[PDB]
Amino acid sequence: SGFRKMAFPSGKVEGCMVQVTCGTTTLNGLWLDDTVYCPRHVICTAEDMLNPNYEDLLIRKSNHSFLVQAGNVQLRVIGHSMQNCLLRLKVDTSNPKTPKYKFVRIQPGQTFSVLACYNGSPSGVYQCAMRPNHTIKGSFLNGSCGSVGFNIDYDCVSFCYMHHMELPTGVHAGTDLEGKFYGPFVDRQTAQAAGTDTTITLNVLAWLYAAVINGDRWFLNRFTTTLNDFNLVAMKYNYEPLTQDHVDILGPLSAQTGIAVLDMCAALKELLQNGMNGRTILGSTILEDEFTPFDVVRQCSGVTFQ
Amino acid sequence: SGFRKMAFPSGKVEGCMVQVTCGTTTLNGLWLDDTVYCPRHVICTAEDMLNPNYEDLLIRKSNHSFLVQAGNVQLRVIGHSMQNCLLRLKVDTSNPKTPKYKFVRIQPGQTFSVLACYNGSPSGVYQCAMRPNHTIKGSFLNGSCGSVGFNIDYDCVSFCYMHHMELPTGVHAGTDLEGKFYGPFVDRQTAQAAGTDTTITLNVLAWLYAAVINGDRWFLNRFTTTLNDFNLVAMKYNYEPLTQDHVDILGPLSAQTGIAVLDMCAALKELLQNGMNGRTILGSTILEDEFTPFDVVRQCSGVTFQ
Ligand SMILES: *[C@@](O)(C(=O)NCc1ccccc1)[C@H](C[C@@H]1CCNC1=O)NC(=O)[C@H](Cc1ccccc1)NC(=O)/C=C/c1ccccc1
Ligand SMILES: *[C@@](O)(C(=O)NCc1ccccc1)[C@H](C[C@@H]1CCNC1=O)NC(=O)[C@H](Cc1ccccc1)NC(=O)/C=C/c1ccccc1
Structure with a gap:
């Protein structure tokens, strides 16, 4: 529980994090195999950020313009290229901790x-x-x-x-x-x-499913809703509209709990209209939107507390 | 921010986690140097938990009654002892990843x-x-x-x-x-x-300091409180009483922000009496008590957003 x-x-x-310094700017890089990735702004000063031309700033650097430290070891840079807003620094050693x-x-x-x-x-x-x-x-x-x-x-x-x-x-x-x-x-x-x-509606519904798996039903109701009537309420509350593809994604959670998606939608509608009345769900007094349906399946028991 | x-x-x-099995019971252990630590209930069945005599259950085991797997490698057990509610299993290999x-x-x-x-x-x-x-x-x-x-x-x-x-x-x-x-x-x-x-009062105050460091003052007030008058309110709200040692711990946060502890106490008192009036603090609609004063100093900038 x-x-x-x-x-x-x-x-x-x-095991992949390193430090990258260019000039007086220092930040972190990601070392996989024999490449270090880092934000291309490592080549800028504060004044350069006001109007940087990255191509013009970069051509003025050499390989030895970059210092890469991995723990206490210096890694020699032997090539560099820009890719969109990152640099790809080639180094003389492949990371042995590369996953x-x-x-x-x-x-x-x-x-x-x-x-x-x-x-x-x-x-x-x-x-x-x-x-x-x-x-x-x-x-x-x-x-x-x-x-x-x-x-x-x-x-x-x-x-x-x-x-x-x-x-x-x-x-x-x-x-x-x-x-x-x-x-x-x-x-x-x-x-x-x-x-x-916007609030991430799919995640809210997933988290209400989590609350039922973990044994709580207080917020359920006898009603059902159409997708469209549900979306009219969602727009009023600054929720993302729900789609059929979202409904489908919630299949496995729906099955584990025996609550149809649109019946869970009606419970959300009621929560939006009426509030939670001083009650909590999974310890929270608000509706939580940072857990995906996959997050819920990963964390929750596969046996609902009926 | x-x-x-x-x-x-x-x-x-x-790098320290292993699996420990005894009989049909499997759970995790912690492998440091040449010892694996694990809950002593690994030696019990479900029926044994109703009234276990651990000394009597353990004397009936040998070293080879325990199987320890570290990734895919089996580690041989070469000694065992109980310490309170853990076992200490001696193994044939020292963990090379021991921090x-x-x-x-x-x-x-x-x-x-x-x-x-x-x-x-x-x-x-x-x-x-x-x-x-x-x-x-x-x-x-x-x-x-x-x-x-x-x-x-x-x-x-x-x-x-x-x-x-x-x-x-x-x-x-x-x-x-x-x-x-x-x-x-x-x-x-x-x-x-x-x-x-109970609510952990010291942590609540630390988290209000975090909110001021990160630039928010809405909940402050012109009042001050005695420690004792503050505690009379705390007891009514199921908060731990605040002590002088707690006050002292909040020194460095008090200094960084320029808000005396007891003036931060009066702001908490007001929050307890009146609520938050639909406002949030550091994104939360409730008072958060799971961040210690040290947690705040570790995470927040050392420069207050004045
Ligand atoms: C990075 O750590 C960083 O790149 N630092 C190095 C640097 C190089 C060149 C110029 C300036 C800085 C940092 C992380 C930020 C800092 C605060 N919180 C974090 O998340 N990034 C920045 O400092 C960036 C640099 C930048 C990138 C893209 C476009 C413009 C600037 N700036 C900001 O993050 C600005 C933050 C800010 C916040 C409040 C008020 C004013 C500015
Ligand atoms: C552990 O993973 C564990 O030890 N499992 C092995 C085991 C050995 C011998 C007998 C039973 C189990 C597990 C972790 C729990 C399970 C659910 N959530 C977790 O945190 N611990 C238990 O299963 C313990 C065993 C126990 C320890 C101390 C005293 C009595 C029993 N039991 C419980 O955790 C009971 C939980 C529970 C929850 C709801 C309703 C009834 C029982």
Whole structure:
């Protein structure tokens, strides 16, 4: 029993973190095989960020313009290239701790674990959703750039995020491990701001299923809803519209609990209209949207407490 | 910016987890140097838990009654002894991944990271407070016994918890790495239940300091309070009484923000009496008590957003 915001175990990723310095700028990199990946802004000063031309800034560097430290060992850089908003530094040593891995671009609403790092040293691990607005509500300070987000499936690490910047509202923006930003953000000083965000409806429903698996039914009701009538309420409450593909994804949770999706929708509608009346669900007084349907199946028992 | 329930990076602990089987019972162990630690109930069946005599159950085992698997390798057991509610299995191989470590008994209100494990394989990591009632609100399923809690200071792992059981309310109980239970619980079937719990007042105040460091002051007020008048309100709201030693602990946070402790107490009093009026603090609609003063200093910037 219990339900916690759980991260994946971080050791396979810890063994990949290094420090990258160019000039007076230092941040973290990710060392897999004989490549180090890092935010391309390592080549900039604070003034350069006001209007950087990365191609022009980079051509002025050599391989020895970059210092890479892995623990206490210096790794020699023997090649460099830009890929979108990252650099790919070739190094003289292949990482012996390289796990099985791949690069994935995750989608809005999906969750991942962040290994916060400073100076190549890991400091903490936490779980994050990718918001509909393509931000994350992280916890990052100066020096955290190049910290990575990841999921683990079997013993394969799927890297999906590298940290680049904080926006004015205090939320965080970054790239996939091809260097393509999530969202419309750019690695230069602008008036950029997080777009309006939405609640991740699919996750809310998944978390209500978790609450039933773990033995609680208080918020269920005798009603049902159409998808469309449900969406009219959703729009009023700044929830994402639910689709049939979402309904299908909730199949396995629906089956485990015996509650049809649209009957769980009607329970959510009631919760939205009436509130929770001073009650909690899985310990929370609000509706939680940072657990996906897969997160619930991973964590919860496969036997409902009936 | 941001503030998240952050765990320590788990790799130093992952490299220590094994599987321990005795008879038909399988659970996890912790392998440091040439010892494996595990819950002594590995020697019991379900019927034995109704009234186990551990001394009598154990004398009937040999070394080869225990099978220890570390990844895919079998480790031979060459000695065994009971220590309180754990076994200490001696093995034929010293763990080459043994970190720098120590065993600590943590105190009520202090926080730690849990590495949930099944069959010797780590599955997730999350942060937990030790409740005043000597329980943790974890997330554990069958097979998680022997999962450990820990803190990391420099590169030293301080192990403080090993998991043994779930109580009827769904919260979790266990031991330190000497095998002494936290709280009044016993490793046998009884009518045992979690005592009434309390809110961890010191942590609430620490988290209000975090909110000021991160730039928010809405809940402050022009008033001050005596310690005693503050405690009269605390008792009415099921908060732990605040003491002078708590006040002292909050010194460094008080200084960083320029808010005296007792003036922060008066802001809490007002919050308790009046509520939060539909507002949030660090994203939360409730007062959070699972971050210690040290947790706040570790995570927050050392420069207040004034
Ligand atoms: C990274 O750690 C980092 O890159 N530091 C090095 C650096 C290089 C060149 C110029 C400036 C800095 C850092 C992480 C941030 C810092 C605070 N919280 C974190 O998440 N990233 C930055 O400092 C970036 C640099 C940048 C990237 C893309 C576009 C413009 C700038 N800037 C920001 O993150 C700005 C944050 C901010 C927050 C509040 C008020 C003003 C500015
Ligand atoms: C452990 O994984 C475990 O030890 N499993 C092996 C075992 C050996 C011998 C007898 C029984 C089981 C497990 C972890 C629990 C299971 C569910 N969530 C977890 O945290 N621990 C238990 O199963 C213990 C065994 C026990 C220890 C101390 C005193 C009595 C029994 N029991 C419980 O945890 C009971 C839980 C429970 C929950 C709801 C309703 C009834 C019982």
